[PDB]
From a paper:
O. volvulus and other parasitic nematodes co-evolved with their hosts and are experts at surviving in hostile microenvironments, where they feed on host blood and release molecules such as macrophage migration inhibitory factor (MIF) homologs to evade or suppress host immune responses for several years without killing the host. O. volvulus and many parasitic nematodes secrete MIF homologs to facilitate evasion of the host’s immune system. OvMIF-1 is a possible drug target.
His-OvMIF-1 has a unique jellyfish-like structure with a prototypical macrophage migration inhibitory factor (MIF) trimer as the ‘head’ and a unique C-terminal ‘tail’. Loop Cys67–Asn71 is disordered in all three monomers, and the N-terminal hexahistidine tag is disordered in all monomers. While the proline is conserved in OvMIF-1, its function is physically obscured in His-OvMIF-1 by the additional N-terminal residues. Interestingly, the in silico-generated OvMIF-1 cavity appears larger than that observed in hMIFs and easily accommodates furosemide, the selective AceMIF inhibitor.
Residue numbers in the entry:
A (entry chain C): 0 to 66, 74 to 111
B (entry chain A): -3 to 66, 73 to 113
C (entry chain B): 0 to 66, 72 to 112
The structure:
Amino acid sequence: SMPAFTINTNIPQSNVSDAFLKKASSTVAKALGKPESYVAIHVNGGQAMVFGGSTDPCAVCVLKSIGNSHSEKLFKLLADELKIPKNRCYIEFVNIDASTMAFNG
Amino acid sequence: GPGSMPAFTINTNIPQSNVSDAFLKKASSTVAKALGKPESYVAIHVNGGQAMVFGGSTDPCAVCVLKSIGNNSHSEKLFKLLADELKIPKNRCYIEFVNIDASTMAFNGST
Amino acid sequence: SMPAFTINTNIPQSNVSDAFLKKASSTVAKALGKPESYVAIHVNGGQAMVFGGSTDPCAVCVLKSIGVNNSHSEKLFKLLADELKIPKNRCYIEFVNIDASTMAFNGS
Ligand code: NA
C-alpha cells in the first residue's frame, strides 16, 4: 500500500518545484512514520477552483492511507511553498479500511 | 482548524480554456443552493483538459463527484449546470453523490 | 453506476493516445464484466508527482466500482507499462469497491 498526498490548487503549476515535491514526500513519510519508498505525492496545479465562494489562491488536499506533529507541518508547507493563505489550505486526512482493530489475548 | 467542506469535482475533457470565471461563480452558487449551505462552506474543482473515455467514446463528457462528510432536484440542477454552461450533453454527464462517515445516526430517548 | 479507471501520471498528456484510451476502456470493461457503455477512463497527465522519493515517470491509479482482480491487475499493469512506457515498478493501482461490504441471502 502507498499513502498518497494529493494537492489540488489554482496556483500555476510552474510554481510547483521538484524541491517542493521532495520536501512534501519527506514530510508525508515522516508524518505517517513510513518509508519514503512507499509514499506518493501528486500536485495538480493550475486548476479552476472555487474555495468558499472565491477563486483566490487555494489548495484542497487529501492525505489517503490504508489503516499530528507533521500534519501542521503539511499545512505550513502548503502555505509557505505555494504562497497560499493558510485559511485557504484544506486537507482531508482519510484512513481507508481502518474501522476495526482486533486483539487476542 | 477542524471543519468539513462539501466539494463538487468535475472531470471533463473539454479544454480548461473553456472554463470561465462566470461558470465557476455559477457552479459555486448552484452547489451551495442545492445543498442549502452558504457558499463559504463549498469547494468547486473543475479538472478540465482531461483525456477521457465515456461509454467507449472520447466525445465531450463529464464525470463528477459531490462529496460531503456527514438528492434528486439537486442532481437535475447540477446536470442543468453542466449541459447549459459547459455544453456537455446530459447523456454524457455522470454524477456520484458520496456521503462519507454517515452510516450511523444515534438517538437517546432524552432527545 | 459507472465503473471508473483513473490514472494520475507525470508523463505529458501528449503521450496519452486515443488508441491507449480505447484499449484501456476495453480492458476495464472485460475485467469487470460490464458493458463498455458504462465504463469511464480518466487519464490526468502532466502532473507534478513524486513516487517513492523519485520524480521519474510513474502512475498512481484507482479502479473504482460500486457493488478476480489479480489476473486483470496484471493486464492493467502491462497496459500501463507497454502503452504509456512507465516501468511496472512505478505503477500503483488501487481496486476500490464502494458500498460492497454486505451480501444478504435467504435460504430459498
Ligand atoms: Na490544524
